[PDB]
Amino acid sequence: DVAGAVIDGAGLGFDVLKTVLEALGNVKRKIAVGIDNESGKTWTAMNTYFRSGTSDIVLPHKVAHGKALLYNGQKNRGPVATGVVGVIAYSMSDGNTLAVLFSVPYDYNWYSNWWNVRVYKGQKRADQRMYEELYYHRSPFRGDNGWHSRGLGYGLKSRGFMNSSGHAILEIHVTKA
Ligand SMILES: [Cl-]
């Protein structure tokens, strides 16, 4: 149950994400991401785009139906007052893209955690334009310690949760609508 592995879907929960957080160690901002695939079809990694921060982790390459992927990121190291903000992209078996946004800021006096999920038509790599779409235009969910559910179209829906603090967990389930 490490970032970069897939686990039986049922196994994904807050604790496994906490384990992922902890293995990152003493850094100011960071995220553990778990996405559970009940789409009915296989996901293959495309790429992650970072607006800010990094990960030393290779996105799990294949995520079969019934598996969950484990991933992480963290702020750029050293004296930069910045967080960890990015977009993950997976290609699905139907030829479309599953896109996930995470945003953990540095300054909670002025900013909050956000996340989002959307299915794009075709093969689309994560990039800055996708960032701006998911963040400014496609109604992102606040990391407000609450669950949020939404239809993805394409026969699918999303359910996920993200906390509100600088050590973020983000738990997403993709299921048949
Ligand atoms: Cl904000």
Side-chain angles (χ1 to χ4, degrees):
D1 306 346
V2 287
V6 310
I7 56 180
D8 281 356
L12 187 65
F14 291 179
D15 45 7
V16 182
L17 302 169
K18 277 170 185 172
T19 295
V20 175
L21 287 181
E22 169 184 7
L24 283 185
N26 180 10
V27 302
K28 187 122 172 140
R29 299 284 182 274
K30 51 175 174 177
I31 188 162
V33 177
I35 314 176
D36 174 39
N37 178 10
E38 305 274 285
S39 49
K41 55 216 172 206
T42 296
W43 307 342
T44 310
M46 279 196 276
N47 75 310
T48 306
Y49 165 72
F50 283 91
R51 183 187 167 256
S52 192
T54 53
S55 177
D56 304 321
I57 295 300
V58 180
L59 268 186
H61 186 58
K62 293 288 171 198
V63 189
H65 176 79
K67 303 299 204 189
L69 71 102
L70 295 189
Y71 190 58
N72 75 40
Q74 61 175 311
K75 64 173 294 279
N76 303 311
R77 297 181 181 70
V80 285
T82 52
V84 52
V85 182
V87 183
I88 302 164
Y90 274 86
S91 59
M92 306 197 272
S93 299
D94 69 342
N96 292 316
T97 296
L98 169 86
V100 181
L101 157 87
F102 52 89
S103 188
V104 190
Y106 180 84
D107 189 354
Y108 287 104
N109 303 331
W110 288 119
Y111 295 101
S112 299
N113 294 359
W114 296 88
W115 67 275
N116 205 353
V117 196
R118 184 176 165 75
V119 174
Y120 276 87
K121 181 192 167 61
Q123 249 61 267
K124 305 293 162 188
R125 290 165 55 70
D127 58 28
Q128 175 66 23
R129 177 189 302 280
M130 198 173 283
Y131 164 75
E132 289 168 14
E133 290 171 3
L134 293 173
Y135 179 79
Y136 294 107
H137 302 293
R138 300 292 164 181
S139 299
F141 310 103
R142 183 173 315 266
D144 56 1
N145 312 303
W147 285 95
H148 296 271
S149 280
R150 199 158 71 195
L152 289 177
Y154 308 82
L156 292 178
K157 69 192 186 307
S158 43
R159 183 168 64 95
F161 177 112
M162 184 192 180
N163 66 333
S164 53
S165 67
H167 292 187
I169 64 174
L170 171 57
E171 183 176 332
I172 294 161
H173 298 268
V174 183
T175 60
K176 305 166 178 200

